[PDB]
């Protein structure tokens, strides 16, 4: 007995039922498959960050003077206009009281 050899008939329908989910993209991708001369050097640069720590925070505290230096030195109808003003209930808390007294 012979049989059908191959098809891809119901497969488009099958793929889309649970939907085609794109790869889980993030910030901070892994450094696997990066040049291991470049990678070992990048690891030494990370290891030797605390050696130049005193200049980092000292420059940041001198540059934080540069903020305080300059931040203190820094310092359609006329009727529908009126009725949209009167009707809304913090701007027009006294215009309604004037209206309310104006029945007498």
């Amino acid at each position: 007995a012979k049989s059908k050899n191959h098809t891809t008939h119901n497969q488009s329908r099958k793929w889309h039922r649970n939907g085609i989910k794109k790869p889980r993209s993030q910030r901070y991708e892994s450094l696997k498959g990066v040049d291991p001369k470049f990678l070992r050097n990048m690891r030494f640069a990370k290891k030797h960050n605390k050696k130049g720590l005193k200049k980092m925070q000292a420059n940041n505290a001198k540059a934080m003077a540069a903020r305080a230096e300059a931040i203190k030195a820094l310092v359609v109808s006329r009727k529908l206009h009126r009725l949209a003003y009167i009707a809304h209930p913090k701007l027009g808390r006294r215009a309604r009281a004037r209206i309310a007294r104006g029945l007498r």
């Binding site: 497969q11 099958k14 793929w15 085609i20 794109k22 790869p23 498959g33 990066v34």
Partner: protein
């Protein structure tokens, strides 16, 4: 069943164009690929070392690794069900800077200049892109002339 194999159905794909054979221009090697810039892949026949598989010819990925002669691309390849973002090592003759990002970065810089200028004045600049809106009313002037009448031509058996 088809014959498997790496260059099967790459006859016109990895060919060089008509009167564009021979020596490879050197600017190709002098363009500077950073880690991140978005790059479109196109295999070349002239250079047989470090080709992309025909799966990738015409796909755009991003660079995650630059070694002496080649760059690492991350290209979204589709299988049956799922899409795989996958990491290939392709020589820089088979590689170009995509101009898809050179239209966005001009937008951002112009978009930001239009907020450096006109933030203090109160004049509000519309930044976002509108699709071509329905056309405005206007007066089609018949400058003296009465429009020519077009009446369909009678049939004549040509050849």
């Amino acid at each position: 069943t088809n014959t498997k194999g790496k260059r099967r159905g790459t006859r016109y794909m990895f060919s060089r164009p008509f009167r564009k054979h021979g020596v490879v221009p050197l600017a190709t090697y002098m363009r500077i690929y950073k880690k991140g810039d978005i790059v479109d892949i196109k295999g070349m026949g002239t250079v047989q070392k470090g080709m992309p598989h025909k799966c990738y010819h015409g796909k755009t990925g991003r660079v995650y690794n630059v070694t002496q002669h080649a760059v690492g691309i991350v290209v979204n390849k589709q299988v049956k069900g799922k899409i795989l973002a996958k990491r290939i090592n392709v020589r820089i003759e088979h590689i170009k800077h995509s101009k898809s990002r050179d239209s966005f970065l001009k937008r951002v810089k112009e978009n930001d200049q239009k907020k450096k200028e006109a933030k203090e004045k109160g004049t509000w600049v519309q930044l976002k892109r509108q699709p071509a809106p329905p056309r405005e009313a206007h007066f089609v002037r018949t400058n003296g002339k009465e429009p020519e009448l077009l009446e369909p031509i009678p049939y004549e058996f040509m050849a």
